[PDB]
Amino acid sequence: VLKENMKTTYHMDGSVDGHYFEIEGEGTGNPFKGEQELKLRVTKGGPLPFAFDILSPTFNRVFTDYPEDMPDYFKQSLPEGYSWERTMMYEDGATATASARISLDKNGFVHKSTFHGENFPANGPVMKKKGVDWEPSSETITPEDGILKGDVEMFLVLEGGQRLKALFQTTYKANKVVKMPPRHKIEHRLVRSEDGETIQLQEHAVAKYFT
Numbered sequence: 182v183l184k185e186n187m188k189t190t191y192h193m194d195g196s197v198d199g200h201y202f203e204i205e206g207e208g209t210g211n212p213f214k215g216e217q218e219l220k221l222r223v224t225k226g227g228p229l230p231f232a233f234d235i236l237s238p239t240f241n242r243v244f245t246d247y248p249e250d251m252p253d254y255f256k257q258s259l260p261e262g263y264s265w266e267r268t269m270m271y272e273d274g275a276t277a278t279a280s281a282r283i284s285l286d287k288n289g290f291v292h293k294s295t296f297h298g299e300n301f302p303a304n305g306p307v308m309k310k311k312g313v314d315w316e317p318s319s320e321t322i323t324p325e326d327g328i329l330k331g332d333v334e335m336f337l338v339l340e341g342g343q344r345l346k347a348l349f350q351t352t353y354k355a356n357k358v359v360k361m362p363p364r365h366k367i368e369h370r371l372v373r374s375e376d377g378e379t380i381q382l383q384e385h386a387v388a389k390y391f392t
Contacts, residue, residue, distance in 0.1 A: 183243070183259055187212055188289035191221060191240060195296030202226030204236070206380075212256065215246035219382040231301060232312030234337055235269075237373055237382055239279045239294050242353065245367055246387040254329055257359035260285050265353045269335075272346040275301040311339045317370040320349075322388075324361045329353040331367070365390055
């Protein structure tokens with residue numbers, strides 16, 4: 182069952198140009214309002230030698246404010262959940278892939294993910310930890326038989342205001358037959374802050390019709 186306040190427990194295994202790491206933490210949010218707040222900690226391989234922002238979109242479209250009349254692929258996937266796979270191509274040739282499975286236990290969501298990045302330039306802003314925040318984005322969601330494809334142009338804001346461009350493509354897969362939505366868009370705003378050694382993330386996400 183899906184509560185007005187839902188918790189999550191997170192575990193990620195990942196590596197970026199040969200540096201292995203693990204991250205764990207907890208989240209809370211209102212899935213019907215598309216709001217969530219996360220508290221994450223690097224549990225292995227810390228401190229990270231790269232900007233945390235390249236990981237942050239890996240850390241659940243159940244937290245999306247959907248219109249009443251638009252079929253909600255992600256909330257329909259419950260209680261079993263859904264999984265997704267994503268490619269991330271940066272304008273400087275760096276590439277990353279990520280996967281996650283969203284499931285339930287007695288306490289709330291279980292979010293298990295992996296991340297693999299390569300060819301981030303040694304003297305570039307990611308490896309020099311110059312990232313600040315992603316721009317708010319507009320992700321196009323396209324139904325294809327029983328799954329969803331998402332495409333979104335992402336722009337990492339660096340210190341000083343320059344943006345680093347990346348293209349994100351995602352395949353979302355429910356574990357069962359659900360009612361498919363039309364092509365639509367999800368507007369995202371992901372914001373990163375810190376509390377000591379804790380990485381904090383806040384996402385707000387709203388689905389909208391085209392036209």
